[PDB]
């Protein structure tokens, strides 16, 4: 690790600076360095880690989608052959994406998840594990595609089981987990009815618990509830 000589606190400080500068590759490298110090992450630090890699992989996913669409049109009936270049470059971006996902999954396996005992940390990391297997699934086509999908499902399911036992229905981590697992069902698992059922039940159970919240917690929960409703509107 090229960050091995930097103080943990300095890595966290620089991750925050990188975020303000919109330098998300740097942010991710700083937070990888912080994880590799071996100490558990606080709530703020977990979110710095997630923000960093979500932005990096989000750019890669967007690029991959553009290139995949160009590749598919180049392979339609009537196209002018334009050589191996589109496939090659889509493959290049795909391999870089897979590398980022493998890096994140490696941090979770070594050793963030096994040391995460509190619900807010363990559910957070298992959601991340589901998310990054889901991104691997988005580009998978080989002997392991079903196994990648089942790895995403298994992580999400363990997270769901803990979240339902240990957090209120308005907890934003619980809500975001359900949002994303619902999308997994719709987009990855070809289970739109499960996707819709999960989003609706999550929304309704959260609605009924809003009365317990402060104004600040209310704002956090209703924000994600609106995303659940947005997806339901898209799907029905």
């Amino acid at each position: 690790g090229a960050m091995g000589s930097m103080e943990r606190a300095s890595l966290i400080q620089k991750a925050k600076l990188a975020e303000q500068a919109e330098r998300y590759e740097d942010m991710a490298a700083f937070m990888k360095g912080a994880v590799e110090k071996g100490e558990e992450l606080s709530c703020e630090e977990r979110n710095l880690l997630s923000v960093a890699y979500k932005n990096v992989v989000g750019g890669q996913r967007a690029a991959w989608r553009v290139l995949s669409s160009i590749e598919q049109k180049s392979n339609e009936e009537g196209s002018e052959e334009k050589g191996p270049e589109v496939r090659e470059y889509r493959e290049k971006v795909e391999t870089e994406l897979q590398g980022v996902c493998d890096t994140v999954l490696g941090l979770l396996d070594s050793h963030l998840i096994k040391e995460a005992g509190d619900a807010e940390s363990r559910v957070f990391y298992l959601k991340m594990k589901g998310d990054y297997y889901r991104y691997l699934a988005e580009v998978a086509t080989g002997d392991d595609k079903k196994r990648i999908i089942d790895s995403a499902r298994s992580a999400y399911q363990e997270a769901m089981d803990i979240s339902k036992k240990e957090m209120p229905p308005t907890n934003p981590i619980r809500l975001g987990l359900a949002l994303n697992f619902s999308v997994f069902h719709y987009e990855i698992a070809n289970s739109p009815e499960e996707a819709i059922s999960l989003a609706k039940t999550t929304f309704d159970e959260a609605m009924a618990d809003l009365h317990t919240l402060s104004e600040d917690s209310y704002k956090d929960s209703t924000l994600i509830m609106q995303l659940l409703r947005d997806n339901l509107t898209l799907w029905t």
Binding site: D131, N180, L227, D230, N231, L234
Partner: peptide, 5 residues
């Protein structure tokens, strides 16, 4: 795309 967080 559908929303994820």
């Amino acid at each position: 795309f559908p929303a994820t967080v």
